[PDB]
Ligand binder design. Structure first.
Ligand SMILES: Cc1cc(CN(CC(C)C)S(=O)(=O)Cc2ccccc2)ccc1-c1ccc(S(C)(=O)=O)cc1
Length: 227
């Protein structure tokens, strides 16, 4: 590996993301002034927890589809044995989604883009899990504060997935290979864009994990009931 090949990896990771980022940043931003009227909010609040579950599950299913496509477009990823490909996605896809989420988050009025407009967290009242919902908003707020760029997301979420410490891995060292190269790519690019400052300011890989497991387990009470 040289700097030229690292930069190729960077450029590549950033192009897989672009091809799989699901929603254009520019559409997201242009629509920040498109906010739910309190009438429309009230409409969401009257819905049963189940209707809301149906919608959220669909949006999360759709989101995860894109994360998978992203990972497939990661060099090295497909070369992995298929057991490991599962292991990584099963452990990492949700975390990546929670990270991608901040693109759709407006920190200036603490709202999120949901089904065509921006709404605050009271939109989700019917689900009856506001500690989970607020913690997600806080997590997205933290990242929006860093002004986390598209390429930073690309490189950062790649490392979320490509983690050789996931229990279950058969050919661990191949993952370390990809992991190590992605860390180099990520760190290098920070220098090139003068964003060294954010590493210290990122939420701990613990924080992402305890959010996602807390998240997945309220998902799993919802899908007990109600496939
Ligand atoms: C994935 C998603 C979800 C939501 C709905 N939920 C989050 C809000 C409550 C913030 S939930 O489903 O996760 C909550 C929930 C559901 C069930 C049980 C417990 C908890 C709203 C916007 C998105 C979204 C879609 C696309 C992008 S992208 C890549 O930029 O294009 C980013 C974000």
């Amino acid at each position: 590996a040289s700097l030229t090949e690292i930069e190729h990896l960077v450029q590549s990771v950033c192009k897989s993301y672009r091809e799989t980022c699901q929603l254009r940043l520019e559409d997201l931003l242009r629509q920040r002034s498109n906010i739910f009227s309190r009438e429309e909010v009230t409409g969401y609040q009257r819905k049963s927890m189940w209707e809301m579950w149906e919608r959220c599950a669909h949006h999360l299913t759709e989101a995860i589809q894109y994360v998978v496509e992203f990972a497939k477009r990661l060099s090295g990823f497909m070369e992995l044995c298929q057991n490991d490909q599962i292991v990584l996605l099963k452990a990492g896809a949700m975390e990546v989604v929670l990270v991608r989420m901040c693109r759709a988050y407006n920190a200036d009025n603490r709202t999120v883009f949901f089904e065509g407009k921006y709404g605050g967290m009271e939109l989700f009242r019917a689900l009856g899990c506001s500690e989970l919902i607020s913690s997600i908003f806080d997590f997205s707020h933290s990242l929006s504060a860093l002004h986390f760029s598209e390429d930073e997301i690309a490189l950062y979420t790649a490392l979320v997935l490509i983690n050789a410490h996931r229990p279950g891995l058969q050919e661990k060292r191949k993952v370390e290979q990809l992991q190590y190269n992605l860390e180099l790519a990520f760190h290098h690019h920070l220098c090139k864009t003068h964003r060294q400052s954010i590493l210290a300011k990122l939420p701990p890989k613990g924080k992402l994990r305890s959010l996602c497991s807390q998240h997945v387990e309220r998902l799993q009470i919802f899908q007990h009931l109600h496939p």
